[PDB]
Amino acid sequence: GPLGSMSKVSFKITLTSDPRLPYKVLSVPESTPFTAVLKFAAEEFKVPAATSAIITNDGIGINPAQTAGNVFLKHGSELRIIPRDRVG
């Protein structure tokens, strides 16, 4: 009976957040690499983080040097990912 918890939260990461299809919302703890988790799932959501950027519903910068908790508190939970520039 393996058990281990203390703090959890539901993070919302929309790759398109379009009206056609639904949004992408997952659940993760506060003590975790926000950037990692984001770029991780986002990478599989046709929304990379290497060349693309991440912003909230309103569109604000985020510090990837923080944990899911810090990013979940500052912003809240509703966040989307999209490209900032293009070259090829």
UniProtKB/Swiss-Prot annotation:
Organism of origin: Homo sapiens (Human)
Task of the protein: Ubiquitin-like modifier which can be covalently attached via an isopeptide bond to lysine residues of substrate proteins as a monomer or a lysine-linked polymer. The so-called ufmylation, requires the UFM1-activating E1 enzyme UBA5, the UFM1-conjugating E2 enzyme UFC1, and the UFM1-ligase E3 enzyme UFL1. Ufmylation is involved in various processes, such as ribosome recycling, response to DNA damage, transcription or reticulophagy (also called ER-phagy) induced in response to endoplasmic reticulum stress.
Disease connection: Leukodystrophy, hypomyelinating, 14: An autosomal recessive, severe disorder characterized by atrophy of the basal ganglia and cerebellum, hypomyelination, severe developmental delay, typically without intentional movements and language development, and microcephaly. Almost all patients exhibit spasticity, extrapyramidal movement abnormalities, and severe drug-resistant epilepsy. Disease onset is early in infancy, and most patients die in the first years of life.
GO BP: brain development; negative regulation of apoptotic process; negative regulation of protein import into nucleus; protein K69-linked ufmylation; protein ufmylation; regulation of intracellular estrogen receptor signaling pathway; response to endoplasmic reticulum stress; reticulophagy
Cross-link named Glycyl lysine isopeptide (Gly-Lys) (interchain with K-? in acceptor proteins), sites: 88
UniProt-recorded name of the protein: Ubiquitin-fold modifier 1
Keyword rRNA processing: no
Induction: Up-regulated by thapsigargin.
Impact after mutating residue 26 to A: Abolished ability to be activated by UBA5
GO cellular component labels: cytoplasm; endoplasmic reticulum; nucleus
Effect annotated for changing residue 53 to F/Q: Abolished ability to be activated by UBA5
Subcellular compartments: Nucleus; Cytoplasm
Gene from which the chain derives: UFM1
Pfam families: Ufm1 (PF03671)
Top-level taxonomic group: Eukaryota
Record keyword Nucleus present: yes
Source organism phylogeny: Eukaryota, Metazoa, Chordata, Craniata, Vertebrata
